[PDB]
Write a protein that binds this DNA or RNA. Sequence first.
RNA 1: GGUCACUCUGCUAUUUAACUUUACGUUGUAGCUCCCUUUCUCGAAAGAGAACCGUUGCUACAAUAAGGCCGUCUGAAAAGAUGUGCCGCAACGCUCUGCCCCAGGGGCAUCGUUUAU
DNA 2: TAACTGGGCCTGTAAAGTTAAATAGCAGAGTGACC
DNA 3: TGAGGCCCAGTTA
Length: 858
Amino acid sequence: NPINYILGLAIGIASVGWAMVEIDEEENPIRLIDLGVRVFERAEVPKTGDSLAMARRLARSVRRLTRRRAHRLLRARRLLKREGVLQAADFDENGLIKSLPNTPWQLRAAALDRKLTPLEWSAVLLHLIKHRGYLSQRKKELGALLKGVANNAHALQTGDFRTPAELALNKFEKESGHIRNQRGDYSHTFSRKDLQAELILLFEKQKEFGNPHVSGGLKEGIETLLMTQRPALSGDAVQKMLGHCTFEPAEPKAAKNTYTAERFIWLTKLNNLRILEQPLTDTERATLMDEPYRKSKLTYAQARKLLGLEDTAFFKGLRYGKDNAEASTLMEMKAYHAISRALEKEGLKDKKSPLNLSSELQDEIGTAFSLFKTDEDITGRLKDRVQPEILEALLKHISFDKFVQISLKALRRIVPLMEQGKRYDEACAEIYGDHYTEEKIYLPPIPADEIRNPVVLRALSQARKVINGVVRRYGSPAIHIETAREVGKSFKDRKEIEFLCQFVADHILLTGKGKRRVFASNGQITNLLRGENDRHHALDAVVVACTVAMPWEFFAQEVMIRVFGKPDGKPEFEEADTPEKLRTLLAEKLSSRPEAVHEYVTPLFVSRAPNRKMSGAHKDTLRSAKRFVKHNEKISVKRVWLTEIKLADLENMVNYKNGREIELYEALKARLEAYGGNAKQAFDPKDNPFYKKGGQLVKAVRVEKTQESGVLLNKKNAYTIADNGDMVRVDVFCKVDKKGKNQYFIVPIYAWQVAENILPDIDCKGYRIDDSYTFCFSLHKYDLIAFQKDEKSKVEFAYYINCDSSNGRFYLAWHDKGSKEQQFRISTQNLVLIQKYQVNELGKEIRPCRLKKRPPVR
RNA sequence: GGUCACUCUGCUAUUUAACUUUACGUUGUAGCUCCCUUUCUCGAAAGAGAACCGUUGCUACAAUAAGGCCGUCUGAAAAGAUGUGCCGCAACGCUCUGCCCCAGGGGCAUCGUUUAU
DNA sequence: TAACTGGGCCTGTAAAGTTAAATAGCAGAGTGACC
DNA sequence: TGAGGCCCAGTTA
């Protein structure tokens, strides 16, 4: 059983194609065997184009935020009890404070004029901690957050406002009518230092007025809780994110702000610099060499005049000849200079004289400040290595933030040769021998660490899966990469239009085609050479497969008929459903020299990768569920803003459907009619506010929404429900006893149910399943199923996408049918007479599968 | 000479991954508040007046995935005090396991890795 | 009275910082394999 | 910027 393969593969943003021929003698093809194609779905979010890992990272972030705020307030209450502000009777069973006032702003303002109750004081402290304002956290033209906070800081620094509470109450409430920020506005934010000042002033004033709980421990604890945050970077956070040195793989990259690395950059600039008059000898280089070290900034014109030069010869590679950008800095020794500045103003350094330190000491402090950012870590690396006065000055002034590509060892080895005049390549060759790649029968797993794009990463991991399936089944081959213009890097550019090279190069076989048995294709040529889309990727696959002058001929007609059974002419063709109609049809229609199918027979349909993850999440909107629980009526209630409302919501208003407020409904509907449904304009704030009967503003109204199912949240504390969302899988249930026909039932399983470890027993429209119902199987996203509509039908295998919770309907699509809007089909199955499972291998191994053990959730 | 690719340095644009925070928004519960269904009470009537529920606006507090776990102590156990406390919406893979498929060989995972105190 | 069907509507957000890394382009110094 | 979730109103067996 020997064959030989030169099968080509096509890469798309969501697709991968393959088609196998066997050119035998030397670069001269034969007829085809097993054409095929697989397809997946992108590593992005369809609507927004963000990364799926991005939503996950923001979930982690907000989880940590809420947890830390809860814990902060918890410790605040503990400190309140510990310092004797409140007694154990003032705390309820949940650990919350009973009769805690809801007037913290007014109390914060009155605390400058009178004494505060222990409960008023506790409310004030916890409110200050909870809304603890914005902290600069930074190492121009400000936006809106910074604008608002800076304006408020300037406002309480001028006149009638001693604290944010006074300014807040008086100005905010009398000018706007509310104190907090509303609907994305930032104009009421205070800087955390302003609130810290409020806290110190409040403690002092309360001590004046005879507050008993002005304890030092209490003040320290409240101030700590207010000010403390975790460091953004700590420990090995920077090191874990570093790359690998080019020559020394066991050694980390050197920091850009170190004497060694900065001088390495300087030497690269100097040695590589050439003057043109219609290189630079060691004396001129050595003149310029130590000039930037204490001369502040070395521009190119200063270098020219420093070495004399002329006006007749030039230093190559510079733009803007007319604008005379000769003061563009040739070199700035920024790390050395910043260290010197720091030690000059704060510590001890004569500005005229050059600050000095063991070159290794400069390297240590540069490394410590680039790799560690908090004072604890920095001193923990600089305590025993150097002494504390300079350490304090440097900790207070210096901040370095980038790296280079060569390790400190390799640099300390290279820089000497570069000072002597040798170049980077010459020094690297003299040291490492100017030679610095195992091949395998299977391509090993892809590395993701060499490119940002998850789209490309997933596309190429699936490309590797496909080519390794080719290598497994159809022997080892001689592959012809072909990546699309859309496939490389898309979204903004892709929406406007609407790494594997090296990996394969070094990690897999080539069978002696000179140097390489590969051909990197140029699909432009593919578009030219060919002399509402189905599985159309045969094109790029074999046009990649077949080192050309670029226009050689062979014949096509067969290939079209193998790609589509209805092809080689009009598409009303029968499209052979079996392999033997394929062989017969193609053979006889091409009758002539039977170069093609007979023994190879290959029916193709795209291999669509399935999604059987169990992870997921419910919807992020919280809705009232009091009626959903207490009276089991299948509705929820949610506020809707008037600027986003429509007549459907207006008719579903809570106080309209129960006739409570009919005239309010009439006025709102009247205004929305007056603008033809333009809710953004009918109820525009500060241009067209809506006023209820009696003069009260209306900004949003509660609207009822049909709630057949959902997940209940905060069950210990409230009646809240959220839409189910993220159906992870739906399990089938087969029952015959219709007294006659045999029926199907489908029960959906969501993510919150895989989290609560519950396995439902309610068919979408049907009701409870007993031991009478017979479980058939369970399917997920993008699984293949058999499909027999009714009495008479072709079995019509197709892939499954969605299930409808209302009636158990199924969104489907077949091979080459991918566009959801264009090509999904939606079949019902209460009477479907057979619905079956299947498996599709990478290539085309469409063998049915079946399991009868109902797989539970964990 | 031309082309392509690669190593290093400088600048520009874009993208990725990780972390610390703020301000919202949503739901609930209090309080004050705009309306308003219903039911009652005083009424001979005219009319008042209470109550639950709904609900407009503002303030506060709680929750903000569903689910699970940590360190530190007073000590015998129940526990009780306490923390700049910690994972959970992604991708990838086949050492441990489960399923599915064809003594191996795979695919998919609720298995494992990035991943943790 | 129960399914089937074509249609259709609602879905969490903005801002402020510390970082590392990848691609592309331009400029500068080299190298290799090809054509 | 889109697709999943799933209801709605009319029709049908």
